[PDB]
Amino acid sequence: NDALHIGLPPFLVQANNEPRVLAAPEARMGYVLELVRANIAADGGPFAAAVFERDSGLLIAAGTNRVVPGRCSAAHAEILALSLAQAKLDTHDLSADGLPACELVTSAEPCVMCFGAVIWSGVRSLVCAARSDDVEAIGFDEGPRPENWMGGLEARGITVTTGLLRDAACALLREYNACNGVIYNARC
Amino acid sequence: MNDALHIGLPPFLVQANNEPRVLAAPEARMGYVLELVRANIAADGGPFAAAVFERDSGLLIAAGTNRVVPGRCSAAHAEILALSLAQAKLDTHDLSADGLPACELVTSAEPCVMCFGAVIWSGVRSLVCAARSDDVEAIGFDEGPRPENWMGGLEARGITVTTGLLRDAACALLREYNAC
Ligand SMILES: Nc1ccn([C@@H]2O[C@H](CO)[C@@H](O)[C@H]2O)c(=O)n1
Ligand SMILES: [Zn+2]
């Protein structure tokens, strides 16, 4: 109660502690989707994200949705990934002098809150898997984002790419929803 | 710290989140939030503060301030901290959980797009702002690309919005921050 403290589950600490370099976009997203599955198993939401150095593929920090277990509605994957990267690099601005250009790789297009977080973070690129329609058509609300939000990011100098490994990302979302119920199911 | 995400709070804010406070009148609530603004500036933070109160009684639940630079966290806006600390105190991610008294976010200035979203997901049923978006822009702070008619967006989701409460007092503090 004397500070904002969002604990990270073991698999996420593991992810943030082990050096990892993933050059290809598919490799980066593949890893982020692995975190989605691991997070679901760790009582978290079906969302994950990670900040990588854009030009080297070095993983800086990863985050996942810890809203329920962390008793914090702001604990979205993007918020955690961006904040943990900033804490590690010791700056609130990921585009600060001397720092490498950063990229946020996310399992799904950001909700309105994370959309804003991306703009303030300093990352220079956003790479998404599942599309907004995918998540919303599955019961996930992205919230009221501004018109042509992608264009807005582009105007902020933030490059946007979406649909990367979309099929696998959507499969994981539907898999989560298939088990998102109170009635026990051994398959879950 | 390494593992978890840990945003430390300055002395005045730790105190604000532990001392009993019941402020019935909206102006009393905002007056207190503005006091946190000045204290935050003295504590190397941005000129913004916010607090979550029980809407009817005025019982203070939690307070937050802009700790972006000293906390090395761009998401550490006043609103994010206030809503998050309130959720931690009430043991839930949803401030609208059945049984909980209606909550209200009293903030020193209209929210940026990130905090606009945070308010929506928080469970608060009311938002009360002092300084207007234009006042914030007037000292170099960006509200970001918020959707058209953001206030209507909140009202459409069951969140009442009040703006301009003690606006001039809030602006006096914003201008002072800019000058110094
Ligand atoms: N892009 C998105 C979309 C949704 N969510 C999460 O799933 C819940 C319902 O949409 C939301 O409450 C939130 O936990 C998310 O983290 N990120
Ligand atoms: Zn989000």
Ligand SMILES: [Zn+2]
């Ligand atoms: Zn904000």
